[PDB]
Amino acid sequence: VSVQPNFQQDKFLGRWFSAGLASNSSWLLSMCKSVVAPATDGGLNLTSTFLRKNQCETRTMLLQPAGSLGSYSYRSPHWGSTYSVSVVETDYDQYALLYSQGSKGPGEDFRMATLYSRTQTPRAELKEKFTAFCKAQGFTEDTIVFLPQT
Ligand SMILES: [Cl-]
Ligand SMILES: [Cl-]
């Protein structure tokens, strides 16, 4: 539930790399580039890309403001569910720790921690930070995955 104090959304913008995740959903990889840009509604558009066969697919997630800076809500029509997404900790220039949790619909159970890094090569200290962060969130070692570059 913790949100990065004095959250500065403009400093959070730009290119990030999804470098790690932990989740309570078995079926939910490799590192993907994400681009964070402002949304019309004051929140964020999160645009991620991944390779399939010979092509680079693009997906956008609208993160709507949810009442406090660094807190968002995401609506997934295909899963009939809404999810809360919070930037728990970030220094803006190197890393971000995100936590997402279902709020409404059949995905209400869902929980996930995400590591964002400004570079494709996260330092050991950041991998230790993320492991410790997931552990704080009740994720066990088996559910923690570091995402390899390409
Ligand atoms: Cl503060
Ligand atoms: Cl760190």
Curated annotation (Swiss-Prot):
Forms a beta-barrel structure that accommodates hydrophobic ligands in its interior. N- and O-glycosylated. Both N-glycosylation recognition sites are almost quantitatively occupied by N-glycans of the biantennary complex type, with a considerable proportion of structures bearing a bisecting GlcNAc. N-glycan at Asn-45: dHex1Hex5HexNAc4. Agalacto structure as well as sialylated and nonsialylated oligosaccharides bearing alpha2-3- and/or alpha2-6-linked NeuNAc are present. Abundant in the brain and CNS, where it is expressed in tissues of the blood-brain barrier and secreted into the cerebro-spinal fluid. Abundantly expressed in the heart. In the male reproductive system, it is expressed in the testis, epididymis and prostate, and is secreted into the seminal fluid. Expressed in the eye and secreted into the aqueous humor. Lower levels detected in various tissue fluids such as serum, normal urine, ascitic fluid and tear fluid. Also found in a number of other organs including ovary, fimbriae of the fallopian tubes, kidney, leukocytes. This is Prostaglandin-H2 D-isomerase. It has been proposed that the urinary and serum levels may provide a sensitive indicator of renal damage in diabetes mellitus and hypertension. Elevated levels in the coronary circulation may also be associated with angina. Changes in charge and molecular weight microheterogeneity, due to modification of the N-linked oligosaccharides, may be associated with neurodegenerative disease and multiple sclerosis. Detected in meningioma but not in other brain tumors and may be considered a specific cell marker for meningioma. Expression levels in amniotic fluid are altered in abnormal pregnancies. Changing L98A: Reduces enzyme activity almost ten-fold. It comes from the Eukaryota. The keyword Ion transport does not apply. Catalyzes the conversion of PGH2 to PGD2, a prostaglandin involved in smooth muscle contraction/relaxation and a potent inhibitor of platelet aggregation. Involved in a variety of CNS functions, such as sedation, NREM sleep and PGE2-induced allodynia, and may have an anti-apoptotic role in oligodendrocytes. Binds small non-substrate lipophilic molecules, including biliverdin, bilirubin, retinal, retinoic acid and thyroid hormone, and may act as a scavenger for harmful hydrophobic molecules and as a secretory retinoid and thyroid hormone transporter. It is an enzyme of class 5 (isomerase). Belongs to the calycin superfamily. Lipocalin family. It catalyses: prostaglandin H2 = prostaglandin D2.
